[PDB]
Amino acid sequence: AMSLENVAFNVVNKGHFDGQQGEVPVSIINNTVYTKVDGVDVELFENKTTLPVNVAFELWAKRNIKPVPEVKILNNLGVDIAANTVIWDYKRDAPAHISTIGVCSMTDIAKKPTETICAPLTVFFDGRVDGQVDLFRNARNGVLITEGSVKGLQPSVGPKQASLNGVTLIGEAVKTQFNYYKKVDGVVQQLPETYFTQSRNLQEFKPRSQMEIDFLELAMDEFIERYKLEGYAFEHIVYGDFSHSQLGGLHLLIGLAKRFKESPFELEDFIPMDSTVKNYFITDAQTGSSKCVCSVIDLLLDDFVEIIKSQDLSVVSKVVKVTIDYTEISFMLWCKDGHVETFYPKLQ
Amino acid sequence: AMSLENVAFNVVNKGHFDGQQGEVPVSIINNTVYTKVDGVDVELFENKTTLPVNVAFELWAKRNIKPVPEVKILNNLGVDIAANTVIWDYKRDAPAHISTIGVCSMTDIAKKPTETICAPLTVFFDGRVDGQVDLFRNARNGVLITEGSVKGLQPSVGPKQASLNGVTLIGEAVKTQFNYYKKVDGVVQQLPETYFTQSRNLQEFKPRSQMEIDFLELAMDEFIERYKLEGYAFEHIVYGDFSHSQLGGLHLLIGLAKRFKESPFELEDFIPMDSTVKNYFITDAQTGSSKCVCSVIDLLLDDFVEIIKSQDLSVVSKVVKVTIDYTEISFMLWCKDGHVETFYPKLQ
Amino acid sequence: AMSLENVAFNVVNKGHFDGQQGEVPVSIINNTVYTKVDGVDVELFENKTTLPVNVAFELWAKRNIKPVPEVKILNNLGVDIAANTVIWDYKRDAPAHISTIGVCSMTDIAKKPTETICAPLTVFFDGRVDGQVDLFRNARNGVLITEGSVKGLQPSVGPKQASLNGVTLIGEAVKTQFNYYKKVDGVVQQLPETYFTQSRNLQEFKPRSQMEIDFLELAMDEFIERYKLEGYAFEHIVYGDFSHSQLGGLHLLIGLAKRFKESPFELEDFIPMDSTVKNYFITDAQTGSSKCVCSVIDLLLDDFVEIIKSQDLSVVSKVVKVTIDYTEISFMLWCKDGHVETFYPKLQ
Amino acid sequence: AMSLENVAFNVVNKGHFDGQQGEVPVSIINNTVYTKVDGVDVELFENKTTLPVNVAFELWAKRNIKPVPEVKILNNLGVDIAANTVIWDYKRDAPAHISTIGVCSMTDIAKKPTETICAPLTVFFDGRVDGQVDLFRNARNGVLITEGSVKGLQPSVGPKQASLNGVTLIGEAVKTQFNYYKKVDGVVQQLPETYFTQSRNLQEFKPRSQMEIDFLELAMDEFIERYKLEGYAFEHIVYGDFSHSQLGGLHLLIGLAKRFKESPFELEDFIPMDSTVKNYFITDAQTGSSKCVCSVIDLLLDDFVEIIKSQDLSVVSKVVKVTIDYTEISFMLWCKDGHVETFYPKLQ
Amino acid sequence: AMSLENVAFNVVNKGHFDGQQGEVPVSIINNTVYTKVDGVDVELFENKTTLPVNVAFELWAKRNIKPVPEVKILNNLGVDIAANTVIWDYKRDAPAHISTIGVCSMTDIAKKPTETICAPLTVFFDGRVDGQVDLFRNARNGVLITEGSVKGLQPSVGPKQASLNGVTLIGEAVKTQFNYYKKVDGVVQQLPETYFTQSRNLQEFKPRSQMEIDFLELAMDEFIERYKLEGYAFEHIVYGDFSHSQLGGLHLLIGLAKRFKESPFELEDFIPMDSTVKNYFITDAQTGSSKCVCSVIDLLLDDFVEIIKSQDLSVVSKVVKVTIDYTEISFMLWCKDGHVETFYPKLQ
Ligand SMILES: NCCNC(=O)Nc1ccccc1
Ligand SMILES: NCCNC(=O)Nc1ccccc1
Ligand SMILES: NCCNC(=O)Nc1ccccc1
Structure with missing residues (x-):
């Protein structure tokens, strides 16, 4: 006995759809659902989907809680x-x-x-x-x-x-x-045997290991010194080079989190979905360095260290596939004289 | 137990709201109500009101049949x-x-x-x-x-x-x-003691008396001759003067119906509603004569004849109030030397 | 090499999509597609679908011609x-x-x-x-x-x-x-062995047999007299009874076409689609008789005669399934004392 | 002292903008302008432009009358x-x-x-x-x-x-x-020395010469016989060949007007505007013959006769420019053995 | 070879328009552009302009990076x-x-x-x-x-x-x-010889001189004491008087930045554009003092000090024009007994 009036009643009284019976009066004005909460209209749902306002209102109310x-x-x-x-x-x-x-x-x-x-x-x-x-x-x-x-x-x-x-x-x-x-x-x-992205925010980033606490606390040349990361381009890939017109490296979320405490930057999420590798149009507000497609992946720092250390550094450029979140994430590993020039998630 | 799905079910199965129980699946795209009639969406109602699409859909389905x-x-x-x-x-x-x-x-x-x-x-x-x-x-x-x-x-x-x-x-x-x-x-x-407008169309006008059949069949100077309408300006008010830049008279629907069989004209109903006196922006397509506000009233021809004949023709201009459809419709009666110059429903 | 600009170019230069290369400048305002035809915007397509304006524009242009x-x-x-x-x-x-x-x-x-x-x-x-x-x-x-x-x-x-x-x-x-x-x-x-609906309009109905010419030309009691249709209720089903508050019968398009030449009526197609049996909310404008769901089917008059005559008239009410347009259209055949009381396409 | 309320007042009381002072209360719902005509909203203007509803409402009210x-x-x-x-x-x-x-x-x-x-x-x-x-x-x-x-x-x-x-x-x-x-x-x-298109409708076409009355009244081979139009393909260009899958010729409005009295046809005006040569997607409803781009021009029949007769019929195909409505309309004149095969307004 | 599908492809793969070839499938639902990112629609651009959604999507993607x-x-x-x-x-x-x-x-x-x-x-x-x-x-x-x-x-x-x-x-x-x-x-x-506004935010304000560090660090009567600002109404203009119903002064951004660390306030940007002088409807959340039009200009504190010190304090009110950002910004300088009563950017 489903209806727009029963779905809205459930939103109003149970916080979501709970199968309870009853109906509240609803009005639809474009892509927005309202209910008369004594005299005046209170908005219950604003449609941001490609589905009709009432069809998407119901799906939203019948979401998994x-x-x-x-x-x-x-x-x-x-x-x-x-x-x-x-x-x-x-x-x-x-x-x-x-x-x-x-x-x-x-x-x-x-x-x-x-x-x-x-x-x-x-x-x-x-x-x-x-x-x-x-x-x-x-x-x-x-x-x-x-x-x-x-x-x-x-x-x-x-x-x-x-x-x-x-x-x-x-x-x-x-x-x-x-x-x-x-x-x-x-x-x-x-x-597959896989890694998992830590799914963290930039505003509320929290380290999840001793290596992550040392990265966020220690200075650049002493984190690398402690973790023997000489010749793995962590200064470029994880720390980020903000010296030239194009922002260099900055592909691990922990590096964006560390750059954030000191200075802010704009991350334009031009394809706002949930993916293992996210693409951002970054503009570092302090230096003015910027990149149009900057692939940022949030792996646990120890996992990225274990991935780059488990690599061959002989060829100039090869495609390094890594199983992360049950998917084959390709990376481009760039090298010169036995060391990493750059190691970023491949733009596919 | 009212709902958009029960209202739409009634529209689909009973032609209108009949209090019957049941629900059909509905989708709302902007100001239009659709129902999935096997696979694809069939439009049940297009909202032309200032009310929300679903509120008006229900009112329309719960109309008096x-x-x-x-x-x-x-x-x-x-x-x-x-x-x-x-x-x-x-x-x-x-x-x-x-x-x-x-x-x-x-x-x-x-x-x-x-x-x-x-x-x-x-x-x-x-x-x-x-x-x-x-x-x-x-x-x-x-x-x-x-x-x-x-x-x-x-x-x-x-x-x-x-x-x-x-x-x-x-x-x-x-x-x-x-x-x-x-x-x-x-x-x-x-x-009040009142007259009633005949509520007729221009496309399907049909005379409702012997005077109306004589008006639509006879020529101008012989309808007036038969009905002793000398000195009342029926040539201007009812027949319509299409000789100058501004269209003269033409205030009785029967005159628009007679002018229609011979030649077409554009009637712009700029305030679309049902009123005893309707205002139109007329453009006679044959002569090019036109009027911005042309008050047209559909009275039975005998009723307009009985209204004008009973009027005193001594003063140059007076306001003639006539009770039509329970409302006092004012008219401006213009005169000179014992005859009517013009007699139109007064522009308030 | 598909695009909104290539689809609109084809609409502008070929009348529809013809696979031709080229692009015209397009602007989208709500649910309407326009093209700048020298200085000002000319409308190429108004979206009436539940699909996005550009997705439907393309489908319409790529239609079967x-x-x-x-x-x-x-x-x-x-x-x-x-x-x-x-x-x-x-x-x-x-x-x-x-x-x-x-x-x-x-x-x-x-x-x-x-x-x-x-x-x-x-x-x-x-x-x-x-x-x-x-x-x-x-x-x-x-x-x-x-x-x-x-x-x-x-x-x-x-x-x-x-x-x-x-x-x-x-x-x-x-x-x-x-x-x-x-x-x-x-x-x-x-x-299946089937009948076909003639798919005709009410405005431009044209008879497609001698029986249909005799039905549209002769009077009621002499068409039945000639075609031996005594005891089959053609006066009710095909001619239509406009004497009571609810419009009686009137289920064959040829009867609506014959009633149309004499007097008009309103047919409200509340489910606008193409079906073998169409449902209309009819209001006969002359008598005022009306029906909320009036199932109207356009069979060739000889076909309806051949369907009803072959039916057994012994039981009071039975479901008569007839294969029309490859679908089994059910009908309710009502009888009394060896004659048909009514025979209409059954309301499921 | 311009305003939406003063523009709408003028629409309500003068039929259009007349510079008169005063204001009526207006409400704007999407692309439609309404005024409260005692209690309920009456629509004054529906916006069909690419301009904002109020900007276009004003332009429409301030139109040339x-x-x-x-x-x-x-x-x-x-x-x-x-x-x-x-x-x-x-x-x-x-x-x-x-x-x-x-x-x-x-x-x-x-x-x-x-x-x-x-x-x-x-x-x-x-x-x-x-x-x-x-x-x-x-x-x-x-x-x-x-x-x-x-x-x-x-x-x-x-x-x-x-x-x-x-x-x-x-x-x-x-x-x-x-x-x-x-x-x-x-x-x-x-x-330039130019011709003028007659700007006529298909529904209300009226001949404007003796040749046009003879074309609409006489049969095909006797109109040509009277006007010595042997070897000019008026049977194809003006009359129209409805025998093959693609509709042949039919480029003069007078031919569409003559085909209309006998049988209807669909003219899809895919670029809705006013042009000297109009392009239509025609489908003759009787034969089923059709054309995607059928250039139709409304010249006076004598003018088209005077244009085609004065043309040289020696070459197989040449571009014939004709000044019509102050624009040089190009035409493709096709010939064979001293006669016209086809002569249509050229598809640029 | 421009198109909505090529513009969206560039947004998806390059972060902006980069002239690269390729097309992604796009759907437009009102004023919003979406792309099917495997199965479901991901929003690429929400139109906030007066331009058509697709015309403005292209302009945004073809912006200067x-x-x-x-x-x-x-x-x-x-x-x-x-x-x-x-x-x-x-x-x-x-x-x-x-x-x-x-x-x-x-x-x-x-x-x-x-x-x-x-x-x-x-x-x-x-x-x-x-x-x-x-x-x-x-x-x-x-x-x-x-x-x-x-x-x-x-x-x-x-x-x-x-x-x-x-x-x-x-x-x-x-x-x-x-x-x-x-x-x-x-x-x-x-x-012209001009000043430049520092274009700073209230949330991330940073002093750009020793005077600005002293203003943000030192108390009111000791900043003025150090910089000999006696009789220049910095307590009113730059500090802001929050004692009466109408908020007094508060016209330099540095004063809003200093009031911000201690207490918040609402700045209603009712004309949200980029101008040298910005107008805000301020409501100090602590005291309840408020102003409808509060002209706030972000000059370097030393520049405002140098402007007010380079003034004549004899007349009660004069218009002080100052060249800032290449434009003539008028100010109203109010005075009494050889000192400034107020000095705000003029409301023009
Ligand atoms: N001729 C005027 C008809 N228009 C309306 O009746 N509009 C309406 C209806 C319900 C609520 C608000 C406005
Ligand atoms: N008579 C029904 C016609 N309506 C449609 O066919 N609507 C449609 C088309 C494509 C996708 C979704 C709905
Ligand atoms: N046949 C074309 C008519 N369409 C327009 O004239 N559109 C328009 C008007 C004003 C500004 C922008 C576009």
């Missing part, structure tokens, strides 16, 4: 659709997937993922919901997340962090570390 | 609101009135007209609906329409025609002639 | 998508189908119909285009139209009429009669 | 701007020109055409307004229209017809024939 | 248009100028500034681009910026700061100090 895998993780694992839930893409103010299953009649391609329409698309299954583990076992294609062990299935320990209502966090009061399982054409998969 | 008094008649009788119905302005694609009573939660000022909010408003009562005659008796202000007699209430036989879903007709299968009753401050006000 | 099966025929044959073409719904100003194949990158689900995404969808194949007959043979699901014979494939002679740029016509300079072929699950399905 | 040269004539004479008036494009619901002079502050580039900004623009001068003849004499570039003689200035008798509020007419009550004068770089340019 | 003079500087120097570049007005989310030269076909008035259309408008020339110095020499009117010396031309050292992608900075990695050259009607100009 539990910690779910980050959109980048789901996209890297070829997830197409979610089973009986809406993964809200909080960085895009839109539903993460094209269609739904058993959620909104207007976006729904199926009511249950058992239907032939779902057979070819990798349906996401939340093992924390009743019966979704068995739905994954019978599903032709899928991605399952579980909190604990699944009999028979070989687990793949995912990232420590998950998204709770847009907030990317490492849960303490809730579990955010999941077991990943992927299936392709009925065959259970052996997920 | 029975013959109701023409909007001009309701406007002349100082009607402000309708009791438990929506009177639709098919001339402007919008509800004839600002607020509702027991229809739409978003426009509703009351559920029943007995409430104190309705006391100073002239609520329209349809005596054809159960209990609306008594609601008129207790209502402080109102306008009642009945098919037959109401005990004690002095009747006022209204126009032969009524609006059935936009179609202004003289009913045969239904009753379009009503009894009018008005009350102001709790006192039943006596309705 | 050859006679194609009417949208109702394609909808009755379960057609979901078109192979490398856009079938335009001129009745709703929008593409007849949700997605495209090898036409627009933004709507495209595939470049060629051979792809696994097209396997469960009924792809429409135009046998008049090179290689589309073989594509139908290999396609898991499809609907093929051919001008002549296809070896092995059992033909189904479709309607005489087809849609040429919105114009439903019976071609003389072009072939509008096609051979239909349908396949489901990789199996060529036998098309 | 006198007969002015047709937009095509002004466009052919290189007119860029109007002096202290707004020439309205009733064919596109927008001001014919980009900027204004002494009309709207928001579009105004100058208050008077004497200003240096107007010097390289061809300002249109209406000699019927006080002082505009002298403004033309001092204006570096301009186009002047006068009713009578201007001393020293060599006249160019323009078309018999002019546009009066969208209505293209040959004035009787007003003068529609003007004297044209053009100046370029401060030098009075001699206007 | 090098340090250019601040919009206020260009407006003060009468710059009308830019030569073969787009100066983005980052404070207005729009292109700084009406038209373009050799950038966007839809805004372009010329391809090269040598054209007669550019002769009367002051074209901005960037001497850092090849051949723009010579274009300035031949240009009738222009404003040239060079990094170094131009033979013959007398330089005018502009501000230390320039705008790099919205970021107003004093370049270290790039040059931001330019040489200004202006030309009027072919005559090279002697630019």
Whole structure:
């Protein structure tokens, strides 16, 4: 017994859609949903999606309010659709997937993922919901997340962090570390050995190791000195060269976090989505140095050190593929006389 | 248990709102309501009101599908609101009135007209609906329409025609002639002795008397000759002078209907509504004669003849008030040497 | 090398998309596409779809400009998508189908119909285009139209009429009669023995038989007298009873065409689309008789006569299914004492 | 003392802007202007321009309500701007020109055409307004229209017809024939000896000569027989060949008017504007013959006869330039053995 | 070979328009540009201008990504248009100028500034681009910026700061100090002796002299004591009187910066543009003192001290013109008994 008036009632009284019965009066003026809160109109939802205002209002209200895998993780694992839930893409103010299953009649391609329409698309299954583990076992294609062990299935320990209502966090009061399982054409998969991006902010960056505390506390030539990083171009790649017209290096988030405490800079996110490697148009406000496409990746500093140290420095330029967030991230490794000139994530 | 999905279901399955239960999936794109009719979107309603698309969609679907008094008649009788119905302005694609009573939660000022909010408003009562005659008796202000007699209430036989879903007709299968009753401050006000406009189109004009058949068939100087209309300026007022830069006279619809069979002309309705006197920006396409404000009124030709003949032709210019459609329409009667120079509905 | 500027160039110089190279300057204001035609903006396309203005502009410009099966025929044959073409719904100003194949990158689900995404969808194949007959043979699901014979494939002679740029016509300079072929699950399905709706207008109705000329020329009780239609309720079903508040019968377009010459009436098409049975909210402007859902079907008069005469008139009410336009149209046949009380296309 | 409320007051009380003082309350909902006409909103103007709703509302209200040269004539004479008036494009619901002079502050580039900004623009001068003849004499570039003689200035008798509020007419009550004068770089340019298009409609076409009455009344092979048009392909060019898939010829409006009485056809005006040669996407509804770009020009039949007969028929294909409406319209004259194969307005 | 799909491709892959070939699929939904980044739509640009979404998307992507003079500087120097570049007005989310030269076909008035259309408008020339110095020499009117010396031309050292992608900075990695050259009607100009506004933020204000460090560090009556500012009303003008209903003085940004560390206040920028003197509706959140138009100018404290000290204090009120940012800023100097009562930038 779904309706715009019942969906808005749930937003008004339960904070989101809770299946409760009741209706509040709604008015729609363009791409914005309002409700008469005694006399005057109070805005419940502003549509920022490509979907019709009422269809997207419902999807937003029927979003998952539990910690779910980050959109980048789901996209890297070829997830197409979610089973009986809406993964809200909080960085895009839109539903993460094209269609739904058993959620909104207007976006729904199926009511249950058992239907032939779902057979070819990798349906996401939340093992924390009743019966979704068995739905994954019978599903032709899928991605399952579980909190604990699944009999028979070989687990793949995912990232420590998950998204709770847009907030990317490492849960303490809730579990955010999941077991990943992927299936392709009925065959259970052996997920790759992978690294995970730390998914941190520039404003609230916090070091997650002793190397990260030493990088943020110690001066440039003494962090490298302590960690034997001579000839790995950390001064260029991680610290960033702000001396010339084009901003040099600055590809690890920890370097942007360190440059931030001292001086600010503009990061223009021209493709605002969730990806393992993010591209920014940076302008360092102090020096005036700038770059149009500056690929910034947030790896744990020890992980980037372990990646660059596990490399061959003989050729001038080669493509270094690294499995990060279940995806093959290509990097361009530039060299000269046994040392790194630059090592940035490849612009593909 | 009202909702956009239940209103749209009723539009799809009953042609309008019929109180039936059920829901169809709806999408709102700007000011237009669509429903997925197997695979693709079919438009159910295009919003042309100043109300939000969904609020107006509901009002339109909950419109009166029975013959109701023409909007001009309701406007002349100082009607402000309708009791438990929506009177639709098919001339402007919008509800004839600002607020509702027991229809739409978003426009509703009351559920029943007995409430104190309705006391100073002239609520329209349809005596054809159960209990609306008594609601008129207790209502402080109102306008009642009945098919037959109401005990004690002095009747006022209204126009032969009524609006059935936009179609202004003289009913045969239904009753379009009503009894009018008005009350102001709790006192039943006596309705004036009035004329009624024939509410006809220019494309489908049809004469409604022998004088009207003689006017549309005979030549100019022989219609006047037969009906002794010498000295009343019917050549200017009713026939229309298309000889100078400014179009002369042409104020009776029957004259526009006669000029239409021979030659076309552009009538720019710059204030699109239903009024007893309509103002048009006319451009006669044959001669090129034109007028910016040309007040055109559709009275029965015999009625205009009976109005002008009964007028005193001694003074040069006087204001002639005539009760038409329950409103006092002022006219400017111009004269010279015992004859009418011009007689037009006065520009206030 | 597709672009909004190349699509608009083709609209400006070729009348539609013709694959020609070149670009005209375009501006987009809301849901409307304009081109600067020396100094000022001339409107090339007004978006009436639920697709983005530029995505729909391209689909409209890349429409099929050859006679194609009417949208109702394609909808009755379960057609979901078109192979490398856009079938335009001129009745709703929008593409007849949700997605495209090898036409627009933004709507495209595939470049060629051979792809696994097209396997469960009924792809429409135009046998008049090179290689589309073989594509139908290999396609898991499809609907093929051919001008002549296809070896092995059992033909189904479709309607005489087809849609040429919105114009439903019976071609003389072009072939509008096609051979239909349908396949489901990789199996060529036998098309039913069917009737075809004449797809005519109310304004320009033209009789297509001697019975139709006799119906439009003769009086009521002498058309029935000549065609021995005693006891079949043609006075109610085909002629229409305009005597009571609710309009009786009037379910054959030929009856609406005959009532039209004498008097006008309002037909509110509340679900604007192309269907075998159309539902209208009729208001006869002369009598005032009206119906909310009046199912009107345009069969050839001889076909409706042949359908009703062959029916058994013993039971009071039975569901009469008739195959019209490849769909099983249900009808409710009401009877009493060996004669038809009413026989209308059943309201599901 | 200009304002949206004063402009709307003038629209409401004078039919257009008349410089009168006063203000009515206005509301703007999207691209539409409304005024509260007692209780409810009545629409005064729907914006169809690329200008802001209020800026265009004012331009429309301050339009020229006198007969002015047709937009095509002004466009052919290189007119860029109007002096202290707004020439309205009733064919596109927008001001014919980009900027204004002494009309709207928001579009105004100058208050008077004497200003240096107007010097390289061809300002249109209406000699019927006080002082505009002298403004033309001092204006570096301009186009002047006068009713009578201007001393020293060599006249160019323009078309018999002019546009009066969208209505293209040959004035009787007003003068529609003007004297044209053009100046370029401060030098009075001699206007060419030209033909004029008759500017007629397909619905209300009326012959304007004995040849045109004979063409619309007589059969094909006897109109040509009477007017000695053997060997000029009037059967193809003017009559139109509806026998093959592509519609042949049909380039004179009189041929479309003659084909119209018998059978209808769809003319898709894909570039909606006023031009000497119009391009249409025609689909003959009877035969099914069609053309994507069918250049249709409305010349007087005698004028087209006089153009084609005077042409040399020796070469296979040559470009025939003809001065029509002050513009050199190119035509492609195709020939074989002393006769015309085709003669159409050339597709540039 | 320009197009919406090529412009968006460049935004997606190069961070801005870089002339690279390629096309990404785009959808336009109202005033917002999106691109399908695998499955779902990612927003590339939200239109905040008065230009059509696609025309303004292109201008934004084709913006100058090098340090250019601040919009206020260009407006003060009468710059009308830019030569073969787009100066983005980052404070207005729009292109700084009406038209373009050799950038966007839809805004372009010329391809090269040598054209007669550019002769009367002051074209901005960037001497850092090849051949723009010579274009300035031949240009009738222009404003040239060079990094170094131009033979013959007398330089005018502009501000230390320039705008790099919205970021107003004093370049270290790039040059931001330019040489200004202006030309009027072919005559090279002697630019005025001028002051420059420091163009600083309230959040990140940084002192740029010893007087500014003493003002931000020292208490009120000891800064004045040290700098002999007795009788110059710095307590009112620069410090600000927050004791009465109307906020007194507070006209120098350094005073707003000092009041900010202690307590916050609301600055309503009701005309959000870049001007030498900015007008704000201030409300001091601590005291409740407020002003509707509070003219705030960011001069270096030593410059304001040198301006007020270089004044005559005899008359009660006079207009003090000061050349700041190449424009004549008027100030109202109020006095009594040989001292300043107030000295604020004049409200013109
Ligand atoms: N002829 C005037 C018709 N227009 C309206 O009736 N507009 C309206 C309706 C409801 C609320 C506000 C305005
Ligand atoms: N009679 C229905 C026609 N309407 C449509 O066909 N709408 C549409 C087209 C493409 C994508 C989504 C909706
Ligand atoms: N047939 C073209 C008519 N369209 C316009 O004239 N558009 C317009 C008007 C004023 C400013 C910008 C565009």
